Amino acid sequence: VPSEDRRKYEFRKVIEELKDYEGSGTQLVTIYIPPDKQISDVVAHVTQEHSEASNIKSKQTRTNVQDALTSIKDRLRYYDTFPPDNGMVVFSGAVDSGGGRTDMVTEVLESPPQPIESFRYHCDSAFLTEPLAEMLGDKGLYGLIVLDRRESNVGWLKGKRVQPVKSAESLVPGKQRKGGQSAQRFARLRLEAIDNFYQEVAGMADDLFVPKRHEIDGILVGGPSPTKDEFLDGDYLHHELQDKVLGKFDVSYTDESGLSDLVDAGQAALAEADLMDDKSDMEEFFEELNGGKLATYGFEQTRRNLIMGSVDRLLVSEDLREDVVIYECPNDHEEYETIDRRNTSPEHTCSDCGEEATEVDREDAIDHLMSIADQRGTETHFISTDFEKGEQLLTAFGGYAGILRYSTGV
Template sequence: MSGDPDIATKRLRLKIALEELREMKGFGTELVTIIIPPDRQISDARTMLQNEHGQAANIKSKGTRKNVQGAIESAISTLNRFKTPGENGLALFVGAIIIGNNKTRMVNVVVDDPPQQLLSFRYRCDSTFELTQLEDMLVDKKSYALFVIDRAEAAYGIASGKRIHVQEHLVSNIMGKHRQGGQSAQRFERLIEEAAHNFFKRATEHACSYWLPNLENIQAVIIGGPGATKDFVVKNDYFHHEITKKIAKTTFDVGYSNESGVRELVDNAGTLMGEIELDAERQLMNRFLEELVKAHPKA
C-alpha cells in the first residue's frame, strides 16, 4: 500500500469513528459539533462555547435546554484537556443520543488526530452531527497508473475510482524491417533498434513525469500491450526507479497500445486491482488490531 502507514491508520480510525457517528441521532438540536482547525485557538472555541451556554438558557423546552447545556459543558471540559488543536485540528461531537424508548445517553467523541487538516471552524447544534469535513478526508484518492506499449505506439494514463484518464498517445514512426542483405541490412537493423530504444525511452519518460507528482496515491503501475514489448521495457529498466517499485508483477495482453488499449487494460487487470486493494485493507486492519491489543491487553 502506498503512502505513510500512519496516515493510513488515521484514515481507518476516522472511518470507524464516522460509521458510529452517522448512526447517532438526537432530539431537536441536542447534538453539538465543534470543528477547530489548526490555526484557531482553543481558548477562542472555549469562549464561544461559554457564550453559547448562556444563550442556551433561553431554550423554552426544559429537556432540550438541559441536554444542550449539558453537551456544551461536556465540550468545554473536554477542550480544557487541550492546549492547541494539534497539527491537523480537532473535532468534538457531544450530545444526548437516542437509545430507544424515548431515552437518551450522553456521548463525547473526540477526533484529535485526523489524517488531514480541518479547513474551517464550525459550531452546530442539530439532531445529527456535522461530519462533512471529516467525510471529505475519506474520499478515495487511490489510483492506478496505466501504460500500454508496442513498437508502433504507446499510451498512458491513470485510473481513479470509476474514472479512466488517458493522458497521452504516442506514435513511434519506427521503420519496418529492411529487405536488403549485407552490411546495409545490418545498418538499417541498428537504426531500427536505436529508434525503438528512443521511442521506449520517450514513452516511459513521459509517463513517469506524469505519474511522479501523484506517486504517493498510486497503488500500482499496470502495464500491458499486444506483444512482447511490454515485458521488454519492464525488464530493461526504462521506467524511473521510484515507478519501478510499483510495477505490478503481471503484465496484460491487450489488442492495441492506444486509448482503447488503456481501457481494455483496466478491464483485464480489474481482478489484480481488487486484490491489491483488498490486501492493503487487510494489512491495515491487522496492523490496527495489533495496536489495539497492545493498548488494551487482556487482564
C-alpha cells in the first residue's frame, strides 16, 4: 500500500481512463466491495447475475454481459478471503473499440484513500466511478476533542469520516436546586475534580494520539462558552498536544455528534493544516530558485537530475494530467515529449539530426519520473494547486520540479 497522495493520483488517472470507455449497450459491470465484505460472497453474487443474464433478450448483450461476469470470477481467484485495506472496486466489460470490434476491459482499484462503505453491484453503459471520485476529497489525520461541563468526546477525523473513540462524564456533584438562599458549592472539591477531569481528557488524548505520533496533522478542540477556553487556557491538556492544536471552536453539543460539529466549524482551519507539508516544500523550492542553486524544474531537467540521484525531493503537481511519449531515432537518441493525456501522440522531429522520430512507448509522465525517484530513494511529494506557490508549480513551472542536494552542470 503506497503513499496516500500517490494513491489519490493513481485513482484519478485510472478513473479518467475508465470513463473514456463505452459499451454498445448495458454490459459494463462495476462492483464496490467493502473490506469486511467476503470475497466468496461477491463471487456468489456474480454467479447469480451470470445465471440471470441468460434471461437477456438480445444475444450480443447476453454474450457480452456473461463474458464480463466470467472475467470477474477469474480475477477474484487472485484475491484472498477479504479485499485489501479500505476495500476494492472491480470494473469489467466488453468495450467498444473501432469497427464493431470489442475488447474486454477488466480492472480492479485496490485500497482507496477512504475505505469503501457499502457493497454495490452496478451494470451500465458506463463504469460507475462517480462514487469513487468522491472518496478522493480529503486527506489527513486529525485529533478531535469536544468537552462540556457535563461530558467529553475524543475521536478521529480520518479524511472526511469522523470516528468517536473515547468518552467521559462530569464527575462533579449534580445540578439540582437553584437559590433557596442556599449554595452548597463544593469549592475546593469541584476544582480538584475539574482539574482531574481535564487531566483525564489529556490522558485520553495521550492514549489515542501518541500512537499515531507525528502521523496526526493537527488537533481540533471544541466546546461552548469559556468551558473550552477554560480547558484550553489552563494548562491541563499537556503542552505536547497543545502544540498541534489548530484552534478552539464554539460547539454547544458535546455528545458523539459534537465531533462532527467541530469538524464543520473548523473546516477553514483544517484546509490550511492540509497545506502544511506542501507550503513548506514550495517555500524551500522557491528559496533555492532565488538562491540560484539546488533547484530544477520542467520535465526534461527534472528527469536528468533524477537519474543522477541528485534530487532530495521530487515535486510534482497533483493536478498534472500529462503523458510522456518516448521516442527512438535511427541514431539511438531517446527523445521525450509531454502532452495532455487525451491527445494523440505528437509527431516529433528529432533535434540532434532533424529526422522524423518514431514513437516506441507512452506512459504517465509522473509515473515515469516517480519510478526513477524510487530507484534512487528520492521522496516524491504531490503538491496541491490550492495555494499560490502550489498553483505556480503547475502554471509557471509545468508541474515538474525538484530540490537538489548537490547542484551540478547545465
